[PDB]
Amino acid sequence: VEKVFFVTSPIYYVNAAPHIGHVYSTLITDVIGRYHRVKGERVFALTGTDEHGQKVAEAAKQKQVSPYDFTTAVAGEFKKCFEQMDYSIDYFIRTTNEQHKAVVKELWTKLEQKGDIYLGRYEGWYSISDESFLTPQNITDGVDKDGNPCKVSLESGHVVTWVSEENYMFRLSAFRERLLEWYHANPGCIVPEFRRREVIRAVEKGLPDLSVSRARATLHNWAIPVPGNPDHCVYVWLDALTNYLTGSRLRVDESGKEVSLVDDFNELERFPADVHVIGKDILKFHAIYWPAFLLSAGLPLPKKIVAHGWWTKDRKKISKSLGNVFDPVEKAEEFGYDALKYFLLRESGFSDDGDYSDKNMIARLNGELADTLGNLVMRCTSAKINVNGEWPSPAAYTEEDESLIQLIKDLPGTADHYYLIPDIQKAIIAVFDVLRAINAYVTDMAPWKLVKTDPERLRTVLYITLEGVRVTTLLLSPILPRKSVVIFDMLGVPEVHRKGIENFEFGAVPPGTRLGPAVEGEVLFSKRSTE
């Protein structure tokens, strides 16, 4: 089926300023969206802010401000950050949006009409910081900000608190068998595989019913009212998850403002998500609660949930109070936006908690972006080697020539597979493996010497080198969007060949194509010293 490729990020709590974690998650969403756009697909990428709940209301109280003003201010900060980070997100959703509120009420009514919501009680532990219900097996002893003994979440280390409330309960226990069918029938639906195995293990053990409302006072009346019961508010998580559905139903003008909410999601062809990008910390809400809500409501389920890991800087926790900060905008100005994005995406895969350091960052910038890629682009466009500033016409290919051509021809199918898992690190490694091959070929062929010795040979070497560099760059373009444009300009690749599966094929740019003009002092990636 042909539809809009729908990729999302989590909507982030606005209790504090945006930091690296939100940027990282949103980057992954951006990259996937971008790759499907260069395949020539329709895309809708979604990100946003999670603005209701006790957590946010209480953060607003701490700063001595009204929830409306606090959420608007912090949401403003997320937008500014994401704009500065230079993503290509199609819409930024806020759970305070009035159309979102309408969608939450529609979904609730469906759950109720289906018979999957009843009035009951939650008596148990709750982590406000995580907005998460927890069993006694999931808490332990710890310390609050006073130094006193308290209970904390095993998941997250945050303070937990005992709740005893009459709440509307969702019949999650009734969806065990159906969720297990779903996992088994779609063994790629959760990524990476070991997180998929965790989810099944958890659901195998059995599911309790889930509280989907809270008494209004507990939430400082900062939440969406339960339809038909003004004393209750909708669980912030049921509210939050619903953003994906809301997003799928919004018509958005060229300014990026929501202008209309459609009744039937099919009308816009986005729902359900092809990929939900999340962090490991919020796996249960997306891989258990969400599909259960959807199954109850008769809505289609998402194709993939991909959950990545947490970050560190110099093998330590990131916090201002702890004295270990990683500001993404600061680091992008110091090293470059595309370079920083490359590093975040190259340095760690989802199974790992990665490690930034200025040292390792400089090693990758110098090693991979400058020595491997940048080097290659300058060689194949150099006045010295490419003396006519054009894509030459190749002569006959040797076996060594053909081995390289083969690697290049195979590259898109391989990189495509990795992007679809999705596993962005593996795609980058695949493209750079081919780049390393091209460098070894060039070294082997010594085109600087061929300029004088054998110009007919130089034509073949140069043509393959240019074509390798174009194809690698096209595949790296979701990761280095600005630099890929520079590279293409230097190579003189026409606009039409910069996008589309058609241009994944070897030889899509004809010989005789002129290179772009050169600048006396220009470099794609400039090396950094080692102090």
Candidates 91, 75, 94; CA nearest to 268 is 91
Footprint of ligand MET on this chain (CB under 6 A)? 10-13, 50, 240-241, 243, 282
Cβ-based nearer residue to ligand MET, 31 or 307: 307
Cβ-based nearer residue to ligand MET, 247 or 412: 247
- Cβ 492 to ligand MET shortest distance, Å: 44
- Cβ 10 to ligand MET shortest distance, Å: 4
| Bridge partners (DSSP) listed for residue 167 | 120
- DSSP per position, 231-243: EEEE-HHHHHHTH
298 sits in the region (left: phi over 0; alpha: psi -120 to 50; else beta) called left
β-pair type (149-153, 160-170): unpaired
What tokens does 175 get? 């969806």
Candidates 146, 19, 43; CA nearest to 419 is 43
How many other C-beta atoms can be found within 10 angstroms of the C-beta atom of residue 98? 8
Candidates 175, 126, 165, 460; CA nearest to 289 is 175
- Cβ 48 to ligand MET shortest distance, Å: 9
Cβ-based nearer residue to ligand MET, 243 or 296: 243
- Cβ 131 to ligand MET shortest distance, Å: 7
- Cβ 244 to ligand MET shortest distance, Å: 7
Cβ-based nearer residue to ligand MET, 296 or 473: 296
Cβ-based nearer residue to ligand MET, 6 or 13: 13
Cβ-based nearer residue to ligand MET, 39 or 249: 249
- Cβ 497 to ligand MET shortest distance, Å: 38
Q: How far is CA 30 from CA 35, 263, 341, 495, in A?
A: 9, 27, 11, 21
- DSSP per position, 473-497: HHHHTTTSHHHHHHHHHHHT--GGG
- Cβ 290 to ligand MET shortest distance, Å: 8
Residues in the chain: 531
Q: Which residue is nearest to ligand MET (CB)?
A: 50
**Half-sphere exposure of residue 386: CA atoms within 13 angstroms, side-chain side:** 29
Cβ-based nearer residue to ligand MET, 11 or 487: 11
